[PDB]
């Protein structure tokens with residue numbers, strides 16, 4: 001009957017407070033610590049996401065991979081008024097669970113969910129959705145999409161000097177082609193944020209890669 005993702009949403013609805021994003025996040029973290037593991041970024045990596053958002057105060061943020069809306073809630077709740085999160089999610093079941101999670105949280109007006117493959121959607125952003133340049137991108141979808149989408153974002157002109165890329169899972173499962181590129185290119189300046197895989201004692205980390213402009 002129910003899926004794991006419907007079980008996570010259900011647990012939130014019964015146990016957290018509506019319109020309160022912090023109870024929504026703590027509820028998801030509790031469910032995933034005691035009942036079923038799921039691929040949410042988690043609290044430890046979440047605090048690194050908090051700080052990054054706090055440091056740069058981004059007006060437009062793009063999230064690749066929504067899943068259950070845990071990072072969406074995590075970032076949306078910290079945005080200054082007027083700022084927006086676009087999130088791209090290729091699975092409609094996840095897209096639907098994400099929407100409802102944001103509604104419960106009362107953050108639905110700060111988020112625009114686009115249901116489709118990011119490689120089809122990134123090229124449409126300027127024309128269809130009015131975009132100039134992104135101030136921040138958060139990558140947490142399929143690990144083989146990080147590099148081709150980072151290059152498609154450049155190709156398309158969605159990046160600007162000072163745009164922050166924040167990439168989950170750079171140690172485990174790992175994102176080798178992406179990590180070696182951004183660390184090797186003069187078009188980015190990178191910092192590694194060592195941490196733990198969500199709900200586990202296994203060493204993971206995030207990578208922050210700030211776009212310096214096109215290479216000469």
Ligand SMILES: Cc1ccc(Cc2cc(O)c(O)c(C(=O)NC/C=C/[C@H]3O[C@@H](n4cnc5c(N)ncnc54)[C@H](O)[C@@H]3O)c2)cc1
Pocket residue numbers: 039040041064065066067068088089090091094116117118119140141142143145168169172173197198
């Ligand atoms: C060793 C080891 C292996 C695996 C793990 C476990 C583990 C730990 C983690 O933190 C992880 O982030 C992952 C992981 O694979 N995440 C993939 C995330 C997919 C979501 O994004 C969606 N999506 C996938 N491609 C696209 C796309 N083009 N455009 C739009 N949405 C897309 C999907 O529809 C899902 O909503 C796995 C831990 C340790």
Ligand SMILES: [Cl-]
Pocket residue numbers: 039040041042066067068069070071072
């Ligand atoms: Cl998440």
Ligand SMILES: [Cl-]
Pocket residue numbers: 041042043044045197198199200
């Ligand atoms: Cl955690």
Ligand SMILES: [Mg+2]
Pocket residue numbers: 039040041140168169
């Ligand atoms: Mg992840």
